[PDB]
Nucleic acid binder design. Structure first.
Ligand code: EFZ
Ligand code: MG
Lengths: 543, 406
RNA sequence: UGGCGCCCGAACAGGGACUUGA
């Protein structure tokens, strides 16, 4: 009595006509046995002459598996309504939970009458068969079954609002706050209700009890955790092993707090072959040892409690690594994680903290549908100065200051006006486009000019080098006039770190300076001493 | 009524935009109003037959507590651009931009009385998300003309004219213009009389069952020009900043010169050194001052080209925007100092800029928002209050273009 | 065999800064 979902092929296409591969004695004998059994059950019907279509049928006891590549790319596109999966942190505590594995899930939903003929079969000695139910591996089987199952459950969920039913590929999670005796009675009602539509589910004896291993999680009625993660204790590590290691402890990061993958992830840069034994760096080894210690004890998450307000405490792990603990009660956290990603080449703690907060907010809305009350390690005044003096429309929701040793702050600030009494440094650099024998230097009002040849440097690198010379050769207060927007843009962002080592050396030199003003003048306009600098840094590079 | 056959743009398929995550408060609101819409017959639940989807958001219009459904038909509008511009496009009157008051009604509730073409209802499909993806999102269609879709006013304009013709006859001085779902009613009458006429128009719409910022002052809109700093004593840094600004402004105004100003910066001098402007330099600076106040010569609106709106965060709650089609050919440069929250100010600036363009050029611009893609996409729906939604892109503002105002 | 997530590399398009030549 399940209403079929109309299906049709893409415009201009017709049902696949593929040749059947001559099966072997052990395959043909098994396949006919399967086909006869399904045919007697009504899941298959014989349409030989009126269905000039074919698909590859093979056995891989023996289990039939037909490859629907030809039909998968010719059927109309479907909308996978539920593409993602529920994070266990988003779930809610249930007194009793049961899992109903829907036996013959797809094979209980009839296929569109006008589409059955396109799913034709062919078995040699042949015999032709067509699917009267949703096939396995077909593009529309998951979406159609979910739609069909949802309509089957709506008249039961409506009658039982207390019961929470979650439907996945094959299994059906039916959670309830009812007692064990009462819950089992209600599950039987669902089992009978499903049986009315032909769907079959197992009995209590053949059912499964918690924990419920689901998509890598080990779900209990009251707590959740990732499945036991064991990291290899080998000596030599290859790119394949690092990829496994990084992925394994990325799964653990969402429950285990303080998981660092920055060093190990860096070892995957520049390596292509998976057999290349990576010489695990001391920093990578240090992180791996720390991660191993974190995984020594078992850490169990907690389920969402809508009656309470989510908190999201963020901690700074250093080197662009952040960790957050989303929780409602103290020390009992629903979910953890990390934000080690760096947006752009140049960033600072405050900008990274905002990005980490945004990432938590985005994942909190999908999981819980509400942003948490952040507890950031940044002073209110410190954040106020940043976003007020920043060119982006940055904003972070209601947050509170938490005093942790690794506080977030701006290591240096650039003056908004020229410094009186500070020697001015006009800095520029020209890089050859062929021999890459660039050059950088500075000219100051006190007749203190300097130049340093550079090699394998780019136009951009030379400009940053010219800035670095001024900071090196200046005092506590320096006025730098650079006619490059690249250097100005990078430094004005007030980064605390970056991939480039040239800019990093500048940052450690900007901090030492008690006052630094970085001006900007158009190039080639004869703007005072900037014209003189170009003469020094282009004598033997540009023309 | 008979449905008007709507044909999608040839060679283009219906939208398949993924639904952005919604908060539980918005999801609960959407289900409450979408179930009522289905009960009234405006929408119908659908299965997985069609792969189309347009994100649906929930907003609260200004001075309102009830929730409002905001369906993002930006991709569908593009995929059916021919239908609602050349086949049934609505001409934009050039008069409302000069009117003292321009009230913005909400006539988007009258579209639901017009059935939608059955062959087109597939593309007007949206999914209501579920928190944590617990249950599958609820998928709906539009059995009636969707509001927020640029084709609905085009189809409904035939009925709208008949509604407004008896009103317009008795009030020839009122310029009524609807863009997507609103009705920009412009009149030169005083504020007291204009509101009475709007009430008369509102009562006019109710007799046909069409239930009904909110008011604008186009005559009070003036583009903010580029202004150079003025001071008695000029330092080397001030001249350098001035020359850099004027040099960049030369791309906009060809008459801007920095020759004599640069002649002051000959040697290597301290940034704090006071430079006494020479007679020639002072005269040339004065020449730049009068050029800037004048409008950009040779800049005209091109209907074919899409408008582009660039917004800059000047700090202290001040935002500067420029609406242009070609670079350095600003059709309109302004400032949003009304403003707390950067995203709230940016959303208000976007809505204000879009409304200004609608009553001036009859088309929303493409927005270059100075904001992160994730930050905006998450918080822009908490402050949005306009039925329409413009196209935006996210850009990294150069440090030297933020100096539109010092 | 398909899907999703992470990382690496390549090709694409545009949105920018800049160098050299004509
Ligand atoms: O609301 C809840 N609470 C809950 C509590 C414990 C468990 Cl193990 C499962 C759930 C549940 C779910 C689910 C899908 C991930 C498997 C259930 F639907 F109830 F089964 O969602
Ligand atoms: Mg140069």
């Amino acid at each position: 009595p399940i209403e079929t979902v109309p299906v049709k092929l893409k415009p201009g296409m017709d049902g696949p006509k593929v040749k059947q591969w001559p099966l072997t004695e052990e395959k043909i004998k098994a396949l006919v046995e399967i086909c006869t059994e399904m045919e007697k059950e009504g899941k298959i019907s014989k349409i030989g002459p009126e269905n000039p279509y074919n698909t590859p049928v093979f056995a891989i006891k023996w289990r039939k598996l037909v490859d629907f590549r030809e039909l998968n790319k010719r059927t109309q596109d479907f909308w996978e309504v539920q593409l993602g999966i529920p994070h266990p942190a988003g779930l809610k505590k249930k007194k009793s939970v049961t899992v109903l594995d829907v036996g013959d899930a797809y094979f209980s939903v009839p296929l569109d009458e006008d589409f059955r003929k396109y799913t034709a079969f062919t078995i040699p000695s042949g015999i032709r068969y067509q699917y009267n139910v949703l096939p396995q591996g077909w593009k529309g089987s998951p979406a159609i079954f979910q739609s069909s199952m949802t309509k089957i459950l709506e008249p039961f969920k409506k009658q039982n609002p207390d019961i929470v039913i979650y439907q996945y590929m094959d299994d059906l999670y039916v959670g309830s706050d009812l007692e064990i005796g009462q819950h089992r009675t209600k599950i039987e009602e669902l089992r009978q209700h499903l049986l009315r539509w032909g769907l079959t589910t197992p009995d209590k004896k053949h059912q499964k009890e918690p924990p419920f291993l689901w998509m890598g999680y080990e779900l209990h009625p009251d707590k959740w955790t990732v499945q036991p993660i064991v990291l290899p204790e080998k000596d030599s590590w290859t790119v394949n092993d690092i990829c496994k290691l990084v992925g394994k402890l990325n799964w653990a990061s969402q429950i285990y707090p303080g998981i660092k993958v920055r060093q190990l992830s860096k070892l995957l840069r520049g390596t292509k072959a998976l057999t290349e034994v990576i010489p695990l760096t001391e920093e990578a080894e240090l992180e791996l040892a720390e991660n191993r210690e974190i995984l020594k004890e078992p850490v169990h998450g907690v389920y969402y409690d809508p009656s309470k307000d989510l908190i999201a405490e963020i901690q700074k792990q250093g080197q662009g690594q952040w960790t957050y603990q989303i929780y409602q009660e103290p020390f009992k956290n629903l979910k953890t994680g990390k934000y080690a990603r760096m947006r752009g080449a140049h960033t600072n703690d405050v900008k990274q903290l905002t990005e980490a907060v945004q990432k938590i907010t985005t994942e909190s809305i999908v999981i819980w549908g509400k942003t948490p009350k952040f507890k950031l390690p940044i002073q209110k005044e410190t954040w106020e100065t940043w976003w007020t003096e920043y060119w982006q429309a940055t904003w972070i929701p209601e947050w509170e200051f938490v005093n942790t040793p690794p506080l977030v702050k701006l290591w240096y600030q650039l003056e908004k006006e020229p410094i009186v009494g500070a020697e001015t440094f006009y800095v520029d650099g020209a890089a050859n486009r062929e021999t890459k024998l660039g050059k950088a230097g500075y000219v100051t009002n006190k007749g203190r000019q300097k130049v340093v040849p550079l090699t394998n440097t780019t136009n951009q690198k030379t400009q940053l080098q010219a800035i670095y010379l001024a900071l090196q050769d200046s005092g506590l207060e320096v006025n730098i006039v650079t006619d490059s927007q690249y250097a100005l843009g990078i430094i004005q962002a007030q980064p605390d770190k970056s991939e480039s080592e040239l800019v990093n050396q500048i940052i450690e030199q900007l901090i030492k300076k008690e006052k630094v003003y970085l001006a900007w003048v158009p190039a080639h306009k004869g703007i005072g001493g900037n014209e003189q600098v170009d003469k020094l840094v282009s004598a033997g590079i540009r023309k | 009524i008979e449905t008007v056959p709507v044909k999608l743009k040839p060679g283009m398929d219906g939208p398949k935009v993924k639904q952005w995550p919604l908060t539980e408060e918005k999801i609960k609101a959407l289900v409450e109003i979408c179930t009522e819409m289905e009960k009234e017959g405006k929408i119908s639940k659908i299965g997985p037959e069609n792969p189309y989807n347009t994100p649906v958001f929930a907003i609260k219009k200004k001075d309102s507590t009830k929730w409002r459904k905001l369906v993002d038909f930006r991709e569908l509008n593009k995929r059916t651009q021919d239908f609602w511009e050349v086949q049934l496009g609505i001409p934009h009157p050039a008069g409302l931009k000069k009117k003292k008051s321009v009230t913005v009604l909400d006539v988007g509730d009258a579209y639901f009385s017009v059935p939608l073409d059955e062959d087109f209802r597939k593309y007007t499909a949206f999914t209501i998300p579920s928190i944590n993806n617990e249950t599958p999102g609820i998928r709906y269609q539009y059995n009636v003309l969707p509001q927020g879709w640029k084709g609905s006013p085009a189809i409904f304009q035939s009925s709208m004219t008949k509604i407004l013709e008896p009103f317009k006859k008795q009030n020839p001085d009122i310029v009524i213009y609807q863009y997507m779902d609103d009705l920009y009613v412009g009149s030169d009458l005083e504020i007291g009389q204009h509101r009475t006429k709007i009430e008369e128009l509102r009562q006019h719409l109710l007799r046909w069952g069409l239930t009904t910022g909110y008011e604008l002052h186009p005559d009070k809109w003036t583009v903010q020009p580029i202004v150079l700093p003025e001071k008695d004593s000029w330092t080397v840094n001030d001249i350098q900043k001035l020359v850099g600004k004027l040099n960049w402004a030369s791309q906009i105004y060809p008459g801007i010169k920095v020759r004599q100003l640069s002649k002051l910066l000959r040697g290597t001098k301290a940034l704090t050194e006071v430079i006494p402007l020479t007679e020639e330099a002072e005269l040339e600076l004065a020449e730049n001052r009068e050029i800037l106040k004048e409008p950009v010569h040779g800049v005209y609106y091109d209907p074919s080209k899409d408008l582009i709106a660039e917004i800059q965060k000047q700090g202290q709650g001040q935002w500067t925007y420029q609406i242009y089609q070609e670079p350095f050919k600003n059709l309109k440069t302004g400032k949003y100092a009304r403003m707390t929250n950067d995203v709230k100010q940016l959303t208000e600036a976007v809505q204000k800029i879009t409304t200004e363009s609608i009553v001036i050029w009859g088309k929303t611009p493409k927005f270059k928002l100075p904001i992160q893609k994730e930050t905006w996409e998450t918080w822009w729906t908490e402050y949005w209050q306009a039925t329409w939604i413009p196209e935006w892109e996210f850009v990294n503002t150069p440090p030297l273009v933020k100096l539109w105002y010092q």
